[PDB]
Design a binder for this molecule. Structure first.
Ligand SMILES: NCc1ccnc(N)c1
Ligand SMILES: NCc1ccnc(N)c1
Lengths: 133, 133
């Protein structure tokens, strides 16, 4: 089968199993893929989305260790454009509307989030060893 | 170059960049390796070492996403023995003494820990957004 270029993007702050499963899902959308992962900038993430603990460099360095990741664009653009897909020869965007154009182009592929497995969920579990009273 | 079987073991609780760098180091000890990673049991870790947030199954599932990991033994034995090295055809043990026999056998390879990159370090950074006064 021909190689298919998949693009996923995100913050990837305090990388956890939920991120890695979503990256696995994107990587496995077809038999033979290149998974490019875009990591959002510190300034744009904080302005448009919310707070981020780790710097772009830290978030990117951690992602390089994930086996599903073939290429990283860091920083990535905050908004995906058709020209961006042309520049990097991206066939499909893997995502969990602003995205109507992607669906009309046949380039939108859904991925799922996993609940209850985040890094902050783990800290909440640590805290339960300390009773309120 | 002939394939070399490397064994590393650990708790791998709330997997972070420091773990992944140490696994990368073990994987890259020689040109061609198989990196087997042993994950310690919940009961033995808590008895002999200290507290663990994630279950063996969770710690193991997260490790499978790391690109350096070729095989996982989960649970692994708490203490490595010469018979264990024979059973899994392990050439070297990558570790950061109880381990004198490994050094005498020529099978001890040192790896390093990275400071300041742990999951709990990140939570400490979150807390600094809240002044004492
Ligand atoms: N590894 C690429 C990258 C991303 C962000 N900041 C850097 N200094 C480098
Ligand atoms: N994936 C192996 C494994 C380790 C611990 N517990 C399980 N149920 C399974």
């Amino acid at each position: 089968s021909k190689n298919v270029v998949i693009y996923a993007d995100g913050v990837y702050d305090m990388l956890h199993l939920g991120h890695m499963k979503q990256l696995e899902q994107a990587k496995k959308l077809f038999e033979n893929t290149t998974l490019i992962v875009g990591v959002t900038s510190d300034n744009e993430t904080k302005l448009f989305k919310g707070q981020v603990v780790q710097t772009l460099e830290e978030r990117t360095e951690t992602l390089k260790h994930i086996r599903w990741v073939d290429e990283i664009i860091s920083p990535c653009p905050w908004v995906v454009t058709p020209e961006f897909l042309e520049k990097y020869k991206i066939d499909y965007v893997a995502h969990d509307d602003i995205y109507a154009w992607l669906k009309r182009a046949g380039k939108f592929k859904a991925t799922q989030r996993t609940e209850g497995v985040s890094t902050t969920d783990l800290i909440v579990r640590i805290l339960k060893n300390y009773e309120d009273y």
